[PDB]
Amino acid sequence: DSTECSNLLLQYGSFCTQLNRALTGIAVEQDKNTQEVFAQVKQIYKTPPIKDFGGFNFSQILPDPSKPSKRSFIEDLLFNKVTLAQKFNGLTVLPPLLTDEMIAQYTSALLAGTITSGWTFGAGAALQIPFAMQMAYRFNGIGVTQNVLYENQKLIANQFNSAIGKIQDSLSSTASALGKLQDVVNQNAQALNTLVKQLSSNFGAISSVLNDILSRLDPPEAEVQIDRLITGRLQSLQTYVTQQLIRAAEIRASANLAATKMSECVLGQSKRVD
Amino acid sequence: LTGTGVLTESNKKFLPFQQFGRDIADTTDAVRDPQTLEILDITPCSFGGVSVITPGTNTSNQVAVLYQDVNCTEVNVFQTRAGCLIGAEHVNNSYECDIPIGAGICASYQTSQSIIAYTMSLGAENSVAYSNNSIAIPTNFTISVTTEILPVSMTKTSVDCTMYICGDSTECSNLLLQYGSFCTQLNRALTGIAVEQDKNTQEVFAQVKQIYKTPP
Amino acid sequence: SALGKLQDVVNQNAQALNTLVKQLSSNFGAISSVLNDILSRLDPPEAEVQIDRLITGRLQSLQTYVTQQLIRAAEIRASANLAATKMSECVLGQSKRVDFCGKGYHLMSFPQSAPHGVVFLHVTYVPAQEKNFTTAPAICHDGKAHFPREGVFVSNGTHWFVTQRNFYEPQIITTDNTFVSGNCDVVIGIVNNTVYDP
Amino acid sequence: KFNGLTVLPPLLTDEMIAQYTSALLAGTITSGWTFGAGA
């Protein structure tokens, strides 16, 4: 809100477009990460209404129709474990392309394809197969004869159900497991907070308000007093942009690792140790 | 205390003896009217970037703009969750995403020869015929060939300090050296980049001890 | 438009160089954008002041360009490492990692060079046409339980066969395709049929 | 190359890259994966 400050500002060349271009690239990359990680299934499969899976119980991970959103129980527990736009300077936030409902639909299609088809849905088209035989195939993968499973099916089913109960109890009880997903929010909130706080620095002038200076001095010294503020705010913006670039690179590396894990661990069986 | 914003009656604030209120930054948030003593809230006027949904000029020259994060009751006018869009018509159908917009809304050019804004569809619905004693076994195959292109090395470059900052001017070079070594610390980084640009190609391609040759 | 990945690098490099060169045409608060004008019109005491502000502007521009180049080079190296890994694994051998050397079951790949990049031609195996059958975990013959050595038990409505899992190729059940493991009152879903002996 | 900025030429020319990809393609076709381990 200053028609005279922007006239001295435009004397600094194209320092105003580089930051916008970099931030736009960051935004595009951050949406491409999610699009690449989740959108790995061509179609949208769904589980049959009858849950006859050889004794295994997947009710705690399948979507819950009774909920307002088509989320699972563990997903609902996860969304309540993460806490935390209100700024009103030239700072805006944009909504992601894919809403949480679409992500839930993707992870439901992936999970319902994994249960029914196994790994065949990742190569060609989904091929139905009983779960009690898919699990024998998976034990045959790790050099254990399938008669071990076929003679102990109830034991493995009970152990899997107990493990699911234990994991749900652990998620519902302890809240410190999601620190990795909490820091990615805290660091950005703190960076925006510092950027906003930088607006209240003298930087060498007599006051940190443009309207205060323009209503008290003459232009020949008003421009001198405005130059320091312009320099300080430009330096703050540049530092913020550089930090954002580095953090975005780190997040992209993490997203690539997640995409590799989804491609290998989920859509197949991995012989890579640990 | 000049400025700009939207005045609003704020009975929530109290200010028993305080004249003004303020926020994290040096921006006032509440003031009291000197004539009649009540507390007024100050909220800045709405603002936001402008985006232009457009098909290629090869096809046509029809556009539709979008003011994101603007409740344009003030400004065919639509209203989405990512802002508000004028110039395109809402459609109850759902197709793939052609021009992404946001919050699950995508735009595309139909035929009518107009621009439509719909909600994207994730994929064709499918449901496997799962059963506890049923299998599906392939009887035929197909061989497919896929392309995958990825870069290896960028363009090596190097710059000169004085020749750029103080080109052919002795009194400029007589002031530049007062800053110490801000020159060599840039050329060193550029040289490192140039060296790794060759290391990348050497790693990617040089993986054979001998040069093999196909029979005639 | 298939080679956008390689074109983007050139486009960004050209844009960065163009912006750096065009940054020389800004006053940065000085009277003129060419120092020759200043040194030929004003006395030293403020000519040096203008020179100093020009120097600060140009030095800041160079620092910004160098930082951007460093970040882009780091990203390019990160991509080149993946390219080298693909060349080592998909080409020089056969990879069992799912969706690493192309969709489907990987067979072999062929490398091709490109301006500032590489291109792989992954050859993959994909099943095409499917059928329906009726399986069974095992089979009783004389109170025992025969399991497939490798493959599945399938039935076309009347007869039972043993076939490989990735291709339909029925064979008569025998003692060379199955192995015995105990009695068959424990397995769930077992259906009993005759087993031929050579 | 007008204001003290230069571009250096790559160490590996475009012909040696082609020679590498020809050696790789000819080893792959005629030897399988055995050419990567030993001889």
Ligand SMILES: *[C@@H]1O[C@H](CO)[C@@H](O[C@@H]2O[C@H](CO)[C@@H](O)[C@H](O)[C@H]2NC(C)=O)[C@H](O)[C@H]1NC(C)=O
């Ligand atoms: C799968 O597990 C769920 C939850 O562990 C089971 O649902 C419970 O069913 C009992 C009755 O048997 C109820 O008393 C509980 O309130 C249910 N819990 C929930 C969260 O709904 C379900 O029965 C199990 N299904 C199978 C086939 O084992």
Ligand SMILES: *[C@@H]1O[C@H](CO)[C@@H](O[C@@H]2O[C@H](CO)[C@@H](O)[C@H](O)[C@H]2NC(C)=O)[C@H](O)[C@H]1NC(C)=O
């Ligand atoms: C397996 O699929 C291939 C095609 O992928 C079939 O080959 C085709 O057979 C038809 C005969 O009706 C010919 O007209 C085509 O020219 C063939 N295509 C090619 C590329 O050769 C093959 O017949 C199928 N095999 C079975 C047993 O169904």
Ligand SMILES: *[C@@H]1O[C@H](CO)[C@@H](O[C@@H]2O[C@H](CO)[C@@H](O)[C@H](O)[C@H]2NC(C)=O)[C@H](O)[C@H]1NC(C)=O
């Ligand atoms: C299931 O497969 C069996 C074995 O191939 C079929 O039995 C043979 O069917 C052919 C018909 O093409 C006859 O010529 C043979 O004499 C049959 N052999 C025996 C031992 O019966 C059987 O017909 C198939 N059933 C169905 C419904 O397709």
Ligand SMILES: *[C@@H]1O[C@H](CO)[C@@H](O[C@@H]2O[C@H](CO)[C@@H](O)[C@H](O)[C@H]2NC(C)=O)[C@H](O)[C@H]1NC(C)=O
């Ligand atoms: C496997 O074959 C045996 C016969 O050898 C079948 O056993 C019969 O089962 C019925 C009903 O369960 C009984 O009434 C008979 O007394 C059983 N006979 C014998 C000799 O045990 C058995 O049904 C067959 N398996 C299946 C799945 O049908």
Ligand SMILES: *[C@@H]1O[C@H](CO)[C@@H](O)[C@H](O)[C@H]1NC(C)=O
């Ligand atoms: C003083 O302020 C009150 C506010 O209600 C106003 O009514 C009054 O006219 C003011 N005094 C004078 C002299 O204008």
Ligand SMILES: *[C@@H]1O[C@H](CO)[C@@H](O)[C@H](O)[C@H]1NC(C)=O
């Ligand atoms: C672009 O225009 C050319 C003619 O100028 C036309 O041949 C071509 O099909 C157009 N491409 C698209 C994608 O519309």
Ligand SMILES: *[C@@H]1O[C@H](CO)[C@@H](O)[C@H](O)[C@H]1NC(C)=O
């Ligand atoms: C937009 O403004 C209208 C009236 O101005 C109001 O009824 C509506 O609730 C507002 N919606 C949002 C999302 O601000």
Ligand SMILES: *[C@@H]1O[C@H](CO)[C@@H](O)[C@H](O)[C@H]1NC(C)=O
């Ligand atoms: C979409 O459908 C709803 C109800 O099904 C209807 O109220 C609305 O007018 C429809 N929109 C269009 C553009 O036809």
Ligand SMILES: *[C@@H]1O[C@H](CO)[C@@H](O)[C@H](O)[C@H]1NC(C)=O
């Ligand atoms: C197998 O049966 C299901 C339902 O009975 C059907 O949808 C599917 O198309 C069948 N498979 C083939 C290959 O026709």
Ligand SMILES: *[C@@H]1O[C@H](CO)[C@@H](O)[C@H](O)[C@H]1NC(C)=O
């Ligand atoms: C398969 O399910 C049917 C009911 O849908 C049931 O009658 C049959 O016993 C089941 N078979 C096995 C092996 O569990």
